[PDB]
């Protein structure tokens, strides 16, 4: 990029404060603030380099954890029952997440960063595994930017539990909105027991670290379907409508009977009067 | 490729007929012509640039469709029911689709082109998301080659739809020949319900965009076995039998119960003379 | 690398002895000796170019075989029954497998290398496919190096077998040792009905060939999580506790009801003291 936004250099401290709550529906989710707890949980973002400290407060009647996939932790913040890693009913405990950016090491070999599509979600309630957790809806996102990464305009986050979009009822969404030429960042997660595959109409990406292709010699496929398993992440930007114009776009499962029941939303791409071309 | 025969520019504008018809036996298939329909439908080839135009004709007594993957279509090419763009009985629809170069955009990042390993299947029989036409037959391949992709001498089509492929009875093939040092290539789909893992006796491919090494520098995993889910496609070329020699060789899904049920078939590979080394 | 000790060019002709023997609770397993016959069986590391022939002895009451992915072998060491290729009871078969450096070929296309992770097991106990082999235990790993490749400091084999790892009962590891700083690779495979989604705490690889970034412009997700299916083969290396430290970190299967069933190991990272922090 050179004219589209692209992320600065990491690292600072960051400091958050997380929650864990039961909802009135027989949900769990997590939150910034008490009161306001989400399905998936919030998008948390950083750049590689950052170093985030997060208080996190278990505000129901179990025990239940922060884990996350891809950051560095060290036991400490495991999120296990095992390391004595989680939190007591009503419990405080200040969970530490550090990123890093890639590089040489002495032995002359090549260090990965942090930097990817990655999520955090529970690891002790219902089992010591968090299956219960994750059903209920404690399951959230994170993003770690390399230096010089392309920013979308907005990101999206979908998650494939068991058989539900984001723990909704079957066929109601979510439906996402955008205008012909937004850059949209879809964050793609998978949770529970079963295998799904995620496909888009009128959109494709790249399969690898960014969904972008870096230039003329990235050899990755482009794709728009792909299949993923439980705790699968991975994500990338489209530019929405790009040689396809606005229109209300389905994205689903395209295991047969996982659409048919329901694993379906809409990409709904707008002219700039906010029409779309056969919607309703 | 310097002595291979490759892909040239596209793009022309091209115009062809398709027809969805009944089988005899209950299944349905998609052809060029009409009493000619197959199960895989015919292969679509196309360069990058080009545009298409098919004049499509629903014979049936149902409502049917044609959606592809990866092209660009503006959405009255959607093929779904919810875009009124599918095709009542007797009737006769236009689809156009288009494909693009890769290039630089404007905001400085790369556009990916088109080409890849594609298919187009039905998404209104049976169900909203065509499960009923798919599982009758109505799928089958798109190839769009890159500017200088190497050409094969023949191409093939494995389709693993449910617990078949192509749809044909247990351990009954398809089984598809070559004489040692042929140029052959796969395209491989997959449909329906389930996961599978393609595999392949004697011979390998680079898990990429081409299925082949572009040269040193690529770090692909080189592959004999893929895990694949519903409406997942790839393609690759390999030498037959090179480094190997004549033979049967077995390919199949590697999940145990899959093959033992019959979903194996063979790719003879030939001496000269004809002959295949301890083979009936 | 510049300071690991990495691959020499191969490639020698090898010989060696394998064994495929019954064990007294009912598993099958190969070994380089009789009567020390292991599940997975012995790792085989060879470098690209070498050619290994295998001695192989039956030394069950049924017949059996050895089936290869990945190498270059004529159809007479196919494994299967279909070509003669196995082994009566008792039996003894002298198995060859080659491997091949990467180079350009006449046409002027890139021929891949047989460098990876790969595998072998039995492809005619119980069913003509080794349904039965596989499921007591006939496997285990092959590993071809590229010259150049960076060497470990130890390799582990990690298998998910149906519901099993390793063919372990339910809950009892295995567990692996390292200390802080260790270079450990792992080798993974999946074997028999079912998909598996592979994830490790506080450590994450490339996904390509070999696990690492070759440097800056390798765009492979680097993840630690991954979805396999039957006779997949993967593997990497990871710096024990770079980053995160000492531990007692979980590896485990993500589907939710095989790691609440059993599905789950320790990779014991430790100080030098040999102590870990939160351990017992
Ligand atoms: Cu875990
Ligand atoms: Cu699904
Ligand atoms: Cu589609
Ligand atoms: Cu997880
Ligand atoms: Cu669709
Ligand atoms: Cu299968
Ligand atoms: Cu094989
Ligand atoms: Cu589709
Ligand atoms: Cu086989
Ligand atoms: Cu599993
Ligand atoms: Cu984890
Ligand atoms: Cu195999």
Not at 76 to 95: F, H, I, L, Q
Not at 185 to 206: D, K, L, P, Q, S
Not at 222 to 242: H, L
Not at 267 to 279: A, E, M, N, R, S
Request: charged share 20%.
């Amino acid at each position: 990029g050179i004219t589209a936004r692209t992320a600065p250099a990491g690292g600072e401290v960051r400091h958050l404060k997380m929650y864990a709550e039961k909802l009135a529906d027989g949900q769990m989710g997590y939150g910034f603030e008490k009161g306001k707890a989400s399905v998936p949980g919030p998008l948390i973002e950083v750049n590689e380099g950052d170093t985030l400290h997060i208080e996190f407060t278990n505000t129901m009647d179990v025990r239940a954890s922060l884990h996350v996939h891809g950051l560095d932790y060290e036991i400490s913040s495991d999120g296990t029952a095992m390391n004595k890693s989680d939190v007591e009913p009503g419990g405080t405990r200040t969970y530490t997440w550090r990123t890093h950016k890639p590089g040489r090491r002495d032995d002359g070999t090549w260090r990965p960063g942090s930097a990817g599509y990655w999520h955090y979600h529970d690891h002790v309630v219902g089992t010591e595994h968090g299956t219960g957790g994750i059903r209920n809806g404690l399951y959230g996102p994170v993003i770690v930017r390399r230096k010089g990464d392309v920013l979308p305009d907005a990101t999206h986050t979908i998650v494939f539990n068991d058989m539900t979009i984001n723990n909704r009822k079957p066929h109601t969404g979510p439906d996402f909105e955008a205008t012909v030429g937004d850059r949209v960042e879809i964050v793609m997660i998978t949770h529970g027991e079963y295998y799904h595959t995620f496909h888009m109409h009128g959109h494709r990406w790249a399969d690898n670290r960014t969904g972008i292709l870096t230039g003329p010699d990235d050899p990755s496929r482009v794709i728009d379907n792909k299949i993923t398993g439980p705790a699968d992440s991975f994500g990338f930007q489209i530019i929405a409508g790009e040689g396809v114009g606005a229109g209300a776009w389905m994205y689903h499962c395209h295991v047969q009977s996982h659409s048919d029941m329901g694993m379906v939303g809409l990409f709904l791409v707008k002219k700039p009067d906010g029409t779309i071309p056969g919607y309703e």
